[PDB]
Amino acid sequence: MGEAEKFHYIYSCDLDINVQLKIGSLEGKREQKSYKAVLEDPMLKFSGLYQETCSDLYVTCQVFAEGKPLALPVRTSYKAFSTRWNWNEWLKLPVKYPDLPRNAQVALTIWDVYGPGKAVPVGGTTVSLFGKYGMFRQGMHDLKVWPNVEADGSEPTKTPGRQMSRLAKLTKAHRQGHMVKVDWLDRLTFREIEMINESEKRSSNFMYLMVEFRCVKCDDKEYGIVYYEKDGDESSPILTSFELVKVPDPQMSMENLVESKHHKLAR
Amino acid sequence: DRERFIDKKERLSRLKSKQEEFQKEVLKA
Amino acid sequence: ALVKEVPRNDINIYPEYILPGIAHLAQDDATIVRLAYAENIALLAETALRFLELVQLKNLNMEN
Amino acid sequence: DQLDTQLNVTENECQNYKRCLEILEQMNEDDSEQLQMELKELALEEERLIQELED
Amino acid sequence: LWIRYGAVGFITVVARQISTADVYCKLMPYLDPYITQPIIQIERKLVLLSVLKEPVSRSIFDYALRSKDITSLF
């Protein structure tokens, strides 16, 4: 009938393993081929836009926190593309779960060849690594790609990856089984969502980079990674007495570090 | 070989002298 | 990096205090910290070197 | 031996340049006029076209 | 294209480093099989890029590259 409802989770500061991000497929069309621009810039004909229907794009994944990069960007391994951009590659990020603060993001940039020794950004997308209540993102996510720009790692990001937006979530919930199934009704409703989707395909030149996050499994359980800090349970033993000690001093019984620095330099 | 080291160093200057001579001849063409 | 001056008591701060003080971070258990040392060692070493130069400009005046 | 091989490399270089000089001299220098008319005819086409594009 | 254009980056730089005599006498012989027309201005990326021959098809390149007996194929 069904396994139980227990919610299992691990603290992010307890999961000392590298974060891994799957770069799935890049759906959508590119910015056509504006031949006006090529007459102005002949180097532009020697660029992935104009050489193949699917240039061999690559993605760089970098983690940012407080607008600063936590480590170097990781690049997808070369994959030759012909009719679709499908890297299908798990990227081991240089950051571990304990290393990630609550506002850690991954800035993902799709890059293309622009003449010799020059990559142009096809687009960029940034998604926060923790959810609205501090749970590491799980499973398959489709991120809005911002054309002709690198992913922005600043806080707040200017390239967030997160009608069809709402419906896709409901569709994913339906496919996972969280939405109730009604065959007569699902058959009719999804045709409309398809019409909406096709209209959005024609209306806008949007691209989506589908990515996936790893699932933490142990004994066939599913653990969500919730953001925590070690000692996060240490509710400080604050007490409101001031009978004798009216003026607390935090440095009270502490090594004088300016004298020890001096000791270490004179003696 | 019996050609001395000193004589070979002279032929090096001769071959080079012709090498740069052929290079200028190339640029004219 | 902001230190453009060398107080006469701090002539030996890098050899004896700062470099020995952070040396444990190069072998740190967390990779994030060794990444931090890898990022900043070039600028730390350059700043220590600039610091040593400023010591000589001071010493040269003291001899002169 | 180092000098022995160097003499061979330098002599080979002279043979190469001499051969290329032979090729450059053996081939007839292209008439700039003949290529230049081909360029001018295409320059007229480009301009006539640019007018069409502007329209 | 990354490799193909990286190669163009090297060849243009080499042509700039060497004299025009060496361009026709040493570097051009190497490039003649991969060029539609031998242009001495190959020091410019635009010149080399526009005179390149078509690349090997990715599919054909991969079939040969991926074959276990690649040595006996060649």
How would you write chain A as a 3-class SS string? CCCCCCCEEEEHHHCCCEEEEEEEEEECCCCCCCHHHHHHCHHHHHEHHHHCCCCCCEEEEEEEECCEECCCCEECCCCCCCCCEEEEEEEEEEEEHHHCCCCCEEEEEEEEEECCCCEEEEEEEEEECECCCCEECCEEEEEEEEECCCCCCCCCCCCECCCHHHHHHHHHHHHHCCCCCCHHHHHHHHHHHHHHHHHHHHHCCCEEEEEEECCEEECCEEEEEECCCCCCCCCCCCCCCCCCCCCCCCCCCCCCHHHHHHHHHHC
For residue E22, the chain B residue with the least C-alpha distance is: B23
Per the CB < 8 A criterion, the answer to whether A160 and A127 are in contact is: yes
Chains D and B: 3 or more CB pairs within 8 Å of each other? yes
d(CA C27, CA D24): 65
For residue B25, the chain E residue with the least C-alpha distance is: E21
Q: How many CB atoms lie within 10 A of CB A168?
A: 14
The shortest CB-CB distance from D7 to any of B11, B26, B29 is to B11
Contact B19 D6 (CB under 8 A): no
β-pair type (A221-226, A216-218) = antiparallel
What are the two backbone dihedrals, phi and then psi, of residue A266, each rounded to the nearest 5 degrees? Answer: -90, -55
> Which of B15, B16, B20 to mutate against chain D (most D CBs within 10 Å)?
B15
B12 touching D, CB under 8 A?
yes
DSSP E57: P
d(CA D24, CA D34): 19
Measured CA distances, C45 to C14, C37, C40 (Å): 9, 11, 8
Closest to E12 in 3D by CA, of E54, E44, E59: E44
Per the CB < 8 A criterion, the answer to whether A78 and A35 are in contact is: no
Kindly calculate the radius of gyration of chain A based on its CA atoms and give it in whole angstroms: 25
Resolution in units of Å: 2.7
Contact C17 A98 (CB under 8 A): no
Contact A96 C35 (CB under 8 A): no
**Greatest CA separation found in chain B?**
40
E19 touching B, CB under 8 A?
yes
Q: How many CB atoms lie within 10 A of CB E74?
A: 7
Measured CA distances, A37 to A49, A81, A118, A151 (Å): 12, 25, 18, 24
Which residues lie across from E14 on neighbouring strands? none
Residue-wise burial string across A1-19, b where 16 or more C-beta atoms lie within 10 A, e elsewhere: eeeeeeeeebbbbebeeeb
Q: How many CB atoms lie within 10 A of CB A49?
A: 22
Chain A nearest-CA distance from E11, in A, is 11
A139: phi > 0 → left, psi -120 to 50 → alpha, else beta; which? Answer: left
Contact D16 E25 (CB under 8 A): yes
d(CA E46, CA C20): 54
Helices (H) and strands (E) in chain B, counts: 1, 0
A46 touching E, CB under 8 A?
yes
Helices (H) and strands (E) in chain E, counts: 6, 0
d(CA E1, CA A120): 13
DSSP D21: H
**What's the distance, CA A249 to chain centroid?**
43
- Cis upstream peptide for A156 (omega within 30°): yes
Q: Of all helices (H) and strands (E), which one includes residue B4?
A: none
Closest to A12 in 3D by CA, of A121, A134, A123: A134
Closest to A80 in 3D by CA, of A59, A61, A54, A49: A54
> Which of A52, A53, A113 to mutate against chain E (most E CBs within 10 Å)?
A113
Contact B12 D18 (CB under 8 A): no
d(CA D50, CA D38): 18
- Three-state SS at C29: coil
For residue D28, the chain B residue with the least C-alpha distance is: B29
E26 touching B, CB under 8 A?
no
Chain B nearest-CA distance from E21, in A, is 6
DSSP D28: P
Contact E24 D16 (CB under 8 A): no
Helix residue ranges, H only, chain D:
2-26, 32-54
Q: Is A89 exposed, middle or buried (0-12, 13-18, 19+ CB in 10 A)?
A: middle
d(CA E11, CA D55): 42
Q: Which amino acid is at C46?
A: E
